């Protein structure tokens, strides 16, 4: 069975864990419980193929940038998550992208830009801003709500499809 190594990155509090747990457990984690390191495995049928998704849920902040290097080296595709109600988190996306590109030495790494918390009415990142940034990286942009599950499947399915587009799986 084909295994996919996915990594969820982004600033603290954007909903990386809530997105992953919505995929893994089909439940919305209402509390705030900051992640140090959490990996998950789940089987998912995507385009008629049973896929083993190995998902690494990461910390929003690391004391040393070098602590991310190892899981960026082993990860095959990256969900780069910001929250649409958190302008700083959108501004922080580029640091994750430049670190992943540096560690992989490639401008063609499978990635999806995820704008989460689309249920909240206090939006401050416009969908055109998000599309502009995703276009500048050549990656898809997907709006999600981990609270309602809108777009959660789309984000992970699209990342798997981007991995396949990049390498034989």
């Amino acid at each position: 069975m084909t295994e996919y190594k996915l990594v969820v990155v982004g600033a603290g509090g954007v909903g990386k864990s809530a997105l992953t747990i919505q995929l893994i457990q089909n439940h919305f984690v209402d509390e705030y419980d900051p992640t140090i390191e959490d990996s998950y495995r789940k089987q998912v049928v995507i385009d008629g193929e049973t896929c083993l998704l190995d998902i690494l849920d990461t910390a929003g902040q690391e004391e040393y940038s070098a602590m991310r290097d190892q899981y960026m080296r082993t990860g095959e595709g990256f969900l780069c998550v910001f929250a649409i109600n958190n302008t700083k988190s959108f501004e922080d996306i580029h640091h994750y992208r430049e670190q992943i590109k540096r560690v992989k030495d490639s401008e063609d790494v499978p990635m999806v830009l995820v704008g989460n918390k689309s249920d909240l009415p206090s939006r401050t990142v416009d969908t055109k801003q998000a599309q502009d940034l995703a276009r500048s990286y050549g990656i898809p942009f997907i709006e999600t709500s981990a609270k309602t599950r809108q777009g959660v499947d789309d984000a992970f399915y699209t990342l798997v499809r981007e991995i396949r587009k990049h390498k034989e799986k």
């Binding site: 995929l23 893994i24 457990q25 089909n26 495995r41 789940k42 089987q43 998912v44 049928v45 995507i46 385009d47 008629g48 959660v152 499947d153 992970f156």
Partner: peptide
């Protein structure tokens, strides 16, 4: 369904 598969318990 395929597109219901993410909701199957682990």
């Amino acid at each position: 369904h395929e597109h219901c598969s993410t909701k199957v318990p682990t």
